[PDB]
Design a protein around this ligand. Sequence first.
Ligand SMILES: [Mg+2]
Lengths: 1212, 134
Amino acid sequence: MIKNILGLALGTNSIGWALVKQDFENKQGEILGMGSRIIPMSQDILGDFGKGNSVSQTAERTKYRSVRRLRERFLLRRERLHRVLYILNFLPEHYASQIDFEKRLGKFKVETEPKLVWKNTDGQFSFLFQNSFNEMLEDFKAAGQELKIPYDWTIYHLRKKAISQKIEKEELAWILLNFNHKRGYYQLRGEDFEEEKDKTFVRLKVDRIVDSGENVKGKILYDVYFENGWKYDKQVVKTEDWVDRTKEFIVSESILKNGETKRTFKAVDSEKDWIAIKTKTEQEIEHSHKTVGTYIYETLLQNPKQKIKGKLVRTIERKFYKEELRQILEKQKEFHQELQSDDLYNDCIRELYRNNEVHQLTLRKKDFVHLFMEDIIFYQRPLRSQKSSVSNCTLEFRKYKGENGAEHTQYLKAIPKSNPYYQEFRLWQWIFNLNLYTKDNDENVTKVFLNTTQDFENLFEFLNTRKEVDQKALLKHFKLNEKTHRWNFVEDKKYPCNETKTMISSRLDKVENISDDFLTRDIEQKIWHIIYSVNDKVEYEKALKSFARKHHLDESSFFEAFRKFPPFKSEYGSFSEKAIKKLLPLMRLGKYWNYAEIDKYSRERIQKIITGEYDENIKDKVREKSVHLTIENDFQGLQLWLAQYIVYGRHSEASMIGKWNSANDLEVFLKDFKQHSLRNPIVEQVITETLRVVKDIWLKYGNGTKDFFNEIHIELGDTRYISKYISGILSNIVRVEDGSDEGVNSKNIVPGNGKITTQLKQDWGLNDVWNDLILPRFERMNQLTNSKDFTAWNENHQKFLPTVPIEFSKGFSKKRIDHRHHALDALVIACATTDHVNLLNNQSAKSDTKRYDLKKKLMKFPKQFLKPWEKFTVDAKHNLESIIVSFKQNLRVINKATNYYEKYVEKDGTKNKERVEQAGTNWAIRKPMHKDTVSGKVDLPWVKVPKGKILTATRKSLDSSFDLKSIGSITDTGIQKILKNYLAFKDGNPELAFSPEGIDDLNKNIEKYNDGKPHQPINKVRVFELGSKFQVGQTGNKKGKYVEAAKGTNLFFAVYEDEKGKRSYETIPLNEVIERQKQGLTSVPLENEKGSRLLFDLSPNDLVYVPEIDENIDSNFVFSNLNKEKISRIYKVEKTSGTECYFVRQDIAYLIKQYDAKTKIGELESQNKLQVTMTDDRIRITDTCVKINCDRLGNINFITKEKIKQIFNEFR
Amino acid sequence: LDKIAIDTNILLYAYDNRDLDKQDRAVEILLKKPFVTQLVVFEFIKVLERRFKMDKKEITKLTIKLLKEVIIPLSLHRDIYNYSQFLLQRYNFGLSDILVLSDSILNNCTILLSEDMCNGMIVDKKLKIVNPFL
DNA sequence: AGACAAAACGACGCGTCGTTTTGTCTCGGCTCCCCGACATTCTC
Ligand SMILES: [Mg+2]
């Protein structure tokens, strides 16, 4: 008779909640609560998740983590190189004296930046390899290029020299460190492809296009021939860009079965595709027939202006670096006796692996070659195991008691699909699911071909041999043909047919020199496990060779046949091995079945079923189905459901229905919710906040008691993922335990559709009140644009309706530009009963009389629907104009982080590797500390610097956007002179001057713009800016990096007062917030430097009240009588900078018109947010605003007596 | 080179003639204009008024004279309560001493002088307690 | 009366809140787990 209704509307980042107490039968009822919860994120995310572009902050954190991890692994490699080389006595005294080797193993001493090559004596720097430098300059003068070159070019000369000559040890250490710097591309799997693997980058010329006689789309397709004599595989339409074109391709050659090259083609562009540049550098290095270091040295010899790093060689296969470093080390080995002294080798071994005697024993057999390449430099870790993330069976469990005395359950991991045993399960399931039909009359022709167990067994022996089965094989097995019979499945679809066993049978047939009886079931399982488990190449052939040794099969073609196996497809079945093991014996029939393979419990249940006695674990439906199971012989060939029930006693997944009793269950459910359990973070956040809001309304309006919500209505308005999950979750509150309400969802949950909501809004006048609420924004726009095009008069309503000009009507929506529409939708959903949704979803009646009862009950006479009560519209107006919007906040600055790291610990007289938790305190910053771009400080005499600001200069490309003002913002004066000379030479047009062709022309003829004076080419210049940039850090060279605050990191805005009364404003950066929160203090200082006491601090999504000019709000409080005037003066912070704070009225979501620099108009000026109110007084918001605090439901929170009592009652 | 502070102990041993040596130590601890916390002055007033039963007028004269000419009062810091609570998790002193240390630290003091505070000890790697009478 | 108090004063620099305008790290390979949606078949 009286019903509590909760209407929920779910958006991308909005939850509209409304609770009403309806009595529809008497046309009575009243609203209780209304609100809209908003999760703030930029509209960039809104426009991105529809298409999808890395829309997750977790992914960005993962990317930074991976970059850092690579960095510290490179550092670790370097450290170990320092340790080993210091042991070998290879580092020079000047360098080695300032690496720590005792406490910080291999690290540099703090506040020192050593270079291996520049010895510093009395403040002067000197090069140490004078003689090799002399030899390199001798080489250049023999080549006749110059006699004056950089000293640090000696490394490539040494790398060439190291191949076939004796170099001193320090050069060799430098070379090893260089190799550690540049490691090269490498795929962990390997898996060498087709032996030819042509993949050859070639540049070809087209001779002629003979017209091929292939007429498509009314245009006749041409063919392509090349001068060196192949044909392009694909045809061509456009003739202009193919005739005598110097086109470059990557082609792949495969020797087909006929004995010819099946050549492919693919158009690629050099200097634009990574693969093309990689292959070109590969071929160009190989054709030189020399190591990459010597190749680089030769290219530097022939073109001394060549850019090596990033231009000449960017990325090459790791094989080149490996082979070059090898050749270097073997060649240097014969001359340096330290590379033969096994004492030193053992010393390095022990130093590097003190606590791992096993690894020491392994490496005591190797030498310095393997230790340097295979151990330190080129060591690539394997992928972490994902086995721990494998799913679990829903049936097999294990129970055990921990140290706490409790009893908890370990899961059993699901079966890999390629396992032969799941193969048996699956294809037996197919055997039972198999049935045949005739093509002529479509009758159930089976029970004539498969009626006895022998037919099943023979079909089994034929399928067991094959690898895939299809229409043809299935028909011809029975001697049937295509023309008369079919098999109830897709006529042209194939089904799996024990892939693993067939494939292994074929490969084992190819090896020969063995009898045709070696392959049995256990052998099949063991070899499958060998293939599935060891997925690493060298390990793979070692396991294969050992298997061929133990099993008396010749390892001659065994390993050759058994090397080329496609790795198993990564997929796992629904169930585990033990469960399927228990299942299969029951559905076995014939000779493969025997009673002894049924376990104890299923045998007992079989005896119980045949006996017909009464068991609590056997239901009546079982006997209903198992009436035919009279004898123990009847337990042959049972289907999946029968065998599953007999094994475990459940008729599939019957669910648990469940029913929550109080807010305790709910809050526990939220406490136990796991991250990343849904499609994407957006819907997960939406669902979690919906749950939280439901709990809050339950507590506030019903005190968490049973069945306080009589019914709940849900609506969404991609997003469909929420329509069913939230309904299933919320069924647990409104479900009835009487047995009437059963299913996936409670019958009380009534999802609707947009048709009902829009029709109710139009009929009941919610649209009219919505326009009346939103219109003043439109009059403000009209006044600001001094026009009348934003309001349109009408005479059917005799009033002004909001509107927009067509050229500002791109995607304007009058609902979308606010926040409370969510709550309005929630309200209009809640009052909609099941009868309304049934009527408006099944309006097709087939007879007017049958649905005429609903017509008369719900609609006025079929014109308009009856209101839920007489004062529905007025009450809805009163609520809608009295809703404050609650905005979720993320002020996470620091949080605690746990660090577990592997380490060898001494326990019970033995060292064991175990994880240790980090000692001391260590915080994790939860915001990006600054922006990526890094600038350096400069001091220019020819510019005036205001106090409190500095000049920072950054390198930028010289391009077409460089006009006189920007050219004057280039820090180099001579570059400015030359550049303005050039720009004058091109009639003052940077676009013509600074095109790549123009830049090239400037570079070639630099004399005729530098007054005839010589100068190096220019491509990038350091432009300087004047502003406030802070140091990134205080260690090493970090004190020279100047960065800018990151986006959305100005989170606190302090408002202070002096004893006289004036307000002072400040914005504290994230650095001081971090430091203060680390020292346990408040985020914002409570007094400024002037001693002014702090009113309070503001953060984005805060709420403030802006009092009228006449009101004197000093000890107002009494925030219970919030009326329309009071609530309309509520502003939400949006951003801050310096002493400026920008605000938007809390009911505004989107502006009527944004700001464009052309028209120079907008709803809230250029920033789309104001430092003042929108109303006519236009008062500084920050000078009179008072901060307020709301809860999830938008209810104000203020100090009261009871609160004051409880502050220290909780301590009492 | 280092902002040195003091506590009520230095003033109290300075005041008394019963131990000449400690009195001396204390007075040459005051010659260098050592900084001082307002809570130190409050406790000094409490002990003069309670233990010694001295008149209000003369102890107030002495306080004013010392603050004008002898010791440099340090402005009471507004974050003293939160910082003292922060030091409270890692340290176990009398809470009055913890407020003294908190206000000394928040004012950038490098060296503190006292007796009943476990000399030589480091407080949040910012300030160390030193017993000067030894 | 003479010598203090303070207003001019000619200087530049500064700074002016109000507002708009400008700037903002990038691409490459590959493996392996989980879930979702829509297709077909069988059973409860
Ligand atoms: Mg004390």
